[PDB]
Point group: D2
Chain length 149, copies 4
């Protein structure tokens, strides 16, 4: 097995751990949100063809959003968000409350969720996010990234 620089998890130890692994790039990101981030799944690029990563779906009735990147001219240049406990859960471990994505083309996708708690910011000067890692219970407990050149 090859390996990739893996950075992060930002968030808490709750939920179940998952790792989608590494691919060639990112085409589309799908997440649900309200006061925190619920569902999270992505459509990766695998050597030129779209490839659906495993779904990390949340049952909560949250609003869905689809982030379509203009692969391969456009790619994530930074990932940022907020982690903190959430009040509505039984629950006391930190969870990803908010997520914000910035592109090399200057596009910004939201702040989805409540911008409340402790802040995390991953600005990328050189390199590509090539896969996601994280934890999901009823919501998105933690998020992590795999990177390559």
């Amino acid at each position: 097995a090859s390996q990739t620089i893996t950075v992060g998890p930002w968030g808490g130890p709750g939920g179940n751990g998952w790792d989608d692994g590494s691919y060639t790039g990112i085409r589309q990101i799908e997440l649900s949100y309200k006061e925190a981030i619920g569902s999270f799944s992505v459509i990766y690029d695998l050597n030129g063809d779209p490839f659906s990563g495993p779904k990390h779906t949340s049952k909560l009735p949250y609003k869905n959003v689809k982030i379509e990147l203009k692969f391969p001219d456009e790619f994530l240049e930074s990932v940022s968000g907020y982690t903190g406990p959430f009040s509505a859960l039984a629950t006391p471990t930190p969870v990803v409350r908010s997520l914000t994505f910035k592109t090399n083309k200057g596009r910004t996708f939201g702040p989805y969720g409540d911008e409340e708690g402790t802040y995390f910011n991953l600005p990328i000067e050189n390199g590509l996010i090539v896969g996601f890692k994280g934890r999901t219970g009823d919501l998105l407990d933690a998020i992590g990234i795999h990177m390559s050149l």
Copy 2:
């Protein structure tokens, strides 16, 4: 796009170029041979699951072989073979006449084909072959490799 160190092609400019891309590792290699190498296709590992790469099948009635590696404890440590023209074709053009694979566990698979022509040898001290690239017409004209850590 991520990229990988791509080394080679060994062989001639004949046939049609193909690139299977990059993956997480190699599970199984299938090739056909007689006096030269005909068919070539591989089952890669993609983040823990087997993944069938495109088939680069030859129509010649050659003998088929299946090389099953004990992924992930066992992996290719070296690739070697012979390149040279092949009388039976009218072509020219050099083609892969022979292939030999050595494993980190000490297993050697063949010499498949005629050990005739100009020799090529890729001994790997550190790193993993993570995908194949090459050219196929009626037979395997050339072969190349993608590598990662």
Copy 3:
């Protein structure tokens, strides 16, 4: 030119930009601090031999510290700190107020400086910090990292 995954800068646009480049690893880190981080320089490993990176020295009369890692068994597992403006300066741009280093061996070096402002945290699950990048004026305005496998 080879390149490395370069992540961040955390901090402000003040001072002058510098990039020490990439090496084989990190042996020793030298910084000065008080209410903010002043000086910053490192002794890298270059293929087995110690190598002094350029000095990014601050003139402020701050307390000096030397962080000696037990290379190569011990290496940085995470970098974290605080960024915010600093009253005592004439310029209003954010500066690195605090820095904290955690090792794979479980050693934690400080919080050096004032743990005041906006927090940044870089937990590393796989990979190695292999060089630093940043900005220095009278103090350490920003800090960034180069990474490899």
Copy 4:
């Protein structure tokens, strides 16, 4: 420790092993030759500045050559040569008899030495030679390469 894809050695087990390690690129290559390759040393690029690698000098009275690449627009695209025993020596083990270097700019540097024995060829489609490894006794017994993106 960071690591690099290391491919090779081509040649025999004679002499003493050496590894110059990894750098940012290659600026200049110095070798001596006659019927085989004698001396071998290189001036690497280390983050923009020239850096002399260890000398692997041969005492034989061979002809010296200096290969100056136009770093960083020009870089090695392939390394090839011949390995075989050499009568003039007392020891019977294979040695590097010949070396040939090709540039991305289309320049070819020699065939230095006797093009006699078993051939080796490393064509690079993507990636950079970033360091050399090998064995030296009275002559160059073996040669290997470190690669990066």
